[PDB]
From a paper:
To initiate filament growth, three junction proteins, namely, FlgK (hook-associated protein 1), FlgL (hook-associated protein 3), and the cap protein FliD (hook-associated protein 2), are sequentially placed at the distal end of the hook. The FlgL and FlgK junction proteins that are located between the FlgE hook and the flagellin filament are indispensable for the formation of the flagellum because both FlgL-deficient bacteria and FlgK-deficient bacteria lack functional flagella and are immotile. To investigate the role of FlgL in hook-filament assembly, we have determined the crystal structures of FlgL from gram-positive Bacillus cereus (bcFlgL) and gram-negative Xanthomonas campestris (xcFlgL). The bcFlgL and xcFlgL structures revealed that the D1 domain of FlgL forms a four-segment structure, irrespective of the bacterial species.
Crystal structures for the truncated bcFlgL and xcFlgL proteins (residues 45–251 and residues 48–364, respectively), which lack ~45 N-terminal residues and ~35 C-terminal residues, were solved by multiwavelength anomalous diffraction (MAD) phasing and single-wavelength anomalous diffraction (SAD) phasing, respectively. The bcFlgL structure was refined to 2.2 Å resolution. xcFlgL was crystallized in two different crystal forms, and we obtained two xcFlgL structures (xcFlgLC2 structure in space group C2 at 1.9 Å resolution; xcFlgLH3 structure in space group H3 at 2.2 Å resolution; xcFlgL structure refers to xcFlgLC2 unless specified). The truncated bcFlgL and xcFlgL proteins adopt one-domain (D1) and two-domain (D1-D2) structures, respectively. xcFlgL contains an additional domain, D2, compared to bcFlgL. In the xcFlgL structure, the α3 helix is split into the α3a and α3b helices, between which the D2 domain is inserted, extending from the middle of the S3 segment. The D2 domain of xcFlgL forms a β-sandwich structure, which consists of a β5-β12-β7-β8-β9 sheet and a β6-β11-β10 sheet. In the xcFlgL structure, the β-sandwich fold of the D2 domain is affixed to the upper part of the helical structure of the D1 domain. The β5 and β6 strands of the D2 domain, which constitute one edge of the β-sandwich, interact with the N-terminal region of the α4a helix from the D1 domain. Notably, the D1-D2 interdomain orientation and interface are essentially identical in the two crystal structures of xcFlgL (xcFlgLC2 and xcFlgLH3) despite different crystal contacts, suggesting that the D1-D2 orientation would not change in different environments and would be recapitulated both in solution and in the flagellum. Our comparative analysis of the two xcFlgL structures (xcFlgLC2 and xcFlgLH3) indicates that the N-terminal and C-terminal regions of the FlgL D1 domain adopt diverse conformations, as observed for flagellin. In the xcFlgLC2 structure, the α4b helix runs downwards as one α-helix.
Numbering used by the authors: 54 to 362
The structure:
């Protein structure tokens, strides 16, 4: 009897504890989702290349405030002051500022909480899985205008492309040998193909594709390869720093817009990760309800057994 009663007491406490934490997580991430939606909107506006330096600086200012509030939300606690987004190292704040970057000092472990016999409900997400471990580009491939380009070539978009072959995961460089001519080269600087450039026409090779507009100069290049991972705070920081740049020449404007288009892509990926994280938090709420109703059936059996004896 004593072992059975301890079990149900434990189930009741476990259910209440995980229910609280999951509720505070939904609140925190709802708030973070609103901020993330405003960051997304500002990223879209940042890609309006007609904005004044003054308009850009306003957007940069707001993005900085949003980034800071996101850090505070990432350090949310549960009302025993245990951190929500630190995994199992929930005693010290998991998101810490170092040299203009945000570091994650929590762990990767998501706790499973027994709410009924053999029936587990996940506790809150480790912060790494909301804020840090975010793929760039389109999630699969990423591409950038080279930082040293002297022309006005915009990288408008890119993707995997089943038409030019099955992409092997490798990196490639599209390099202009003339105003209207490019070469595509692999990791080893070896020639894969050449092509004629026309504004907005797809450049296709090696299982990947890109679209370029404007006027690339001879020697300008564009790199394309596997996506990396970048935390959302760095993505916002890099967008802010780009917006604050001077754009006196067509070349400088093109450099900023390339950087801002890339930031926006990476932001789109961070937005998708937040959607998913938020959604995951609701998925097991019916099991908590079921655990709670089973516990109500236990009240009825306890009360009748108590009355009998």
């Amino acid at each position: 009897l004593d072992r059975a009663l301890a079990a149900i007491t434990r189930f009741g406490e476990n259910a209440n504890n995980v229910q609280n934490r999951l509720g505070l997580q939904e609140n925190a991430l709802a708030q973070a989702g609103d901020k993330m939606a405003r960051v997304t909107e500002l990223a879209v506006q940042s890609n309006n290349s007609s904005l004044s330096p003054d308009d850009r600086k306003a957007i940069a200012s707001e993005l900085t405030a949003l980034r800071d509030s996101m850090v505070s939300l990432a350090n949310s606690t549960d009302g025993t002051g245990r951190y929500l987004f630190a995994g199992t190292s929930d005693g010290n704040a998991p998101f810490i500022k170092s040299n203009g970057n945000v570091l994650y000092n929590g762990d990767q472990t998501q706790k499973q909480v027994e709410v009924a016999p053999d029936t587990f409900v996940s506790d809150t997400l480790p912060g790494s899985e909301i804020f840090m471990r975010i793929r760039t580009g389109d999630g699969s491939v990423d591409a950038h205008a080279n930082a040293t380009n002297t022309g006005t070539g915009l990288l408008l978009d890119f993707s995997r492309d089943a038409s030019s072959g099955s992409w092997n995961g490798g990196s490639y460089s599209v390099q202009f040998t003339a105003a209207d001519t490019y070469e595509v080269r692999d990791s080893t600087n070896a020639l894969v193909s050449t092509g004629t450039y026309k504004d907005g026409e797809d450049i296709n090779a090696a299982g990947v594709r890109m679209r370029i507009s404007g006027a690339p100069a001879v020697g300008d290049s564009f790199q394309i390869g596997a996506s990396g991972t970048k935390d959302v705070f760095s993505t916002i920081d890099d967008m802010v720093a780009a917006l604050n740049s001077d754009t006196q020449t067509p070349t400088q404007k093109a450099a900023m817009i390339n950087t801002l288009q890339s930031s926006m892509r990476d932001i789109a990926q961070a937005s998708s990760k937040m959607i998913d994280a938020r959604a995951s938090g609701g998925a097991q709420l019916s099991v908590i309800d079921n655990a709670n109703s089973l516990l109500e059936s236990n009240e009825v059996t306890l009360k009748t057994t108590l009355s009998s004896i």
